[PDB]
Amino acid sequence: LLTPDDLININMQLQKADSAVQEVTGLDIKGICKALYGTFSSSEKVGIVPVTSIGNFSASLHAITQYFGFDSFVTDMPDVSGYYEAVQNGAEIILMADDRTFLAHNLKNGKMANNQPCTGIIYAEIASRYLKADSKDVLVVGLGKVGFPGAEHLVQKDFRVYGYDADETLLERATSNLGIIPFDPANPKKFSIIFEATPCANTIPEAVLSENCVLSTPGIPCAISEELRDKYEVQLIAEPLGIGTASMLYSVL
Numbered sequence: 001l002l003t004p005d006d007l008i009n010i011n012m013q014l015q016k017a018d019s020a021v022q023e024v025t026g027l028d029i030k031g032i033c034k035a036l037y038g039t040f041s042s043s044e045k046v047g048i049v050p051v052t053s054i055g056n057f058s059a060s061l062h063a064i065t066q067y068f069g070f071d072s073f074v075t076d077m078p079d080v081s082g083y084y085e086a087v088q089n090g091a092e093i094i095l096m097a098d099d100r101t102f103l104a105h106n107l108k109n110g111k112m113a114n115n116q117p118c119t120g121i122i123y124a125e126i127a128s129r130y131l132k133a134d135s136k137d138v139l140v141v142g143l144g145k146v147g148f149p150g151a152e153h154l155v156q157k158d159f160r161v162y163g164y165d166a167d168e169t170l171l172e173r174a175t176s177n178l179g180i181i182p183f184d185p186a187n188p189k190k191f192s193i194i195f196e197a198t199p200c201a202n203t204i205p206e207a208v209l210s211e212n213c214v215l216s217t218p219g220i221p222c223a224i225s226e227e228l229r230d231k232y233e234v235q236l237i238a239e240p241l242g243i244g245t246a247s248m249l250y251s252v253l
């Protein structure tokens with residue numbers, strides 16, 4: 001059960017993100033998704049299954065999917081009984097997550113999505129569509145399960161991708177495997193486009209920021225302080241769950 005404040009925050013954050021994405025790219029979240037995957041929604045029936053491997057996650061997904069126009073429902077039962085319930089009640093897409101994997105499975109066309117690459121890809125896509133960019137230089141901070149697919153997507157779109165991760169071994173593998181330029185956080189290079197995907201605060205050094213730069217980040221907590229954000233007028237794209245979820249659903253349509 002979402003508290004009233006929880007429900008209100010979900011819609012508020014989504015609308016905030018919709019506007020920020022429109023400001024940055026000229027399209028809303030839905031517009032980005034359709035252009036990214038070339039798919040469109042028909043209010044597909046989305047069955048959301050709670051998994052005991054439980055707070056408001058299912059309830060939050062319900063609000064999120066409703067916001068994006070999907071005919072969604074949360075099953076009464078959890079786990080395998082819930083799955084059965086969802087399929088029996090005509091779910092075309094199943095949405096469920098344990099601590100390790102959050103997936104969307106379209107039972108109609110057999111396409112399946114993982115939240116991690118779907119999130120990195122859409123946030124990278126948003127960042128890459130900054131209209132007033134004037135450079136193809138992009139900084140990626142965090143090359144984990146969300147960050148790496150995002151970097152890969154930016155490379156595939158022929159951007160000049162700089163990457164940093166505080167895990168050296170991972171940085172090495174990312175730099176050899178997709179042609180990203182290792183970035184030294186002591187490099188005083190300014191960026192107008194930044195994609196960040198870490199679970200840590202203060203991961204973007206001040207010296208890296210330009211005026212009005214786009215910072216596209218699914219990471220939690222925020223990659224920069226409120227002070228630096230206001231000081232450099234950073235165009236922030238950051239939202240806890242919905243954007244990635246939209247990316248998952250459109251990717252399997």
Ligand SMILES: NC(=O)c1ccc[n+]([C@@H]2O[C@H](COP(=O)([O-])OP(=O)(O)OC[C@H]3O[C@@H](n4cnc5c(N)ncnc54)[C@H](O)[C@@H]3O)[C@@H](O)[C@H]2O)c1
Pocket residue numbers: 115116119141142143144145146147164165166167170197198199200202203217218219220221239240241242243244245
């Ligand atoms: N907003 C959303 O919709 C959404 C969806 C999925 C995940 N997330 C969040 O995104 C974040 C990333 O998830 P993930 O699965 O990629 O985690 P992960 O552990 O796979 O990757 C995080 C990476 O950040 C790196 N890192 C940590 N501190 C750093 C620093 N100071 N500089 C550079 N790199 C640093 C780590 O070495 C690690 O490789 C998490 O906070 C997760 O909760 C958000």
Ligand SMILES: NCCCC[C@@H](N)C(=O)NCCC[C@H](N)C(=O)O
Pocket residue numbers: 049050051052053054055056057058097098099100102220240
């Ligand atoms: N930062 C958001 C990325 C997802 C985090 C992940 N650790 C997570 O909490 N997954 C959801 C678990 C959902 C739970 N099984 C439920 O159905 O209530």
Ligand SMILES: [Mg+2]
Pocket residue numbers: 119218239240241242243244245
């Ligand atoms: Mg999100």
Ligand code: NA
Pocket residue numbers: 196197198199200201203219220221222223
């Ligand atoms: Na972060």
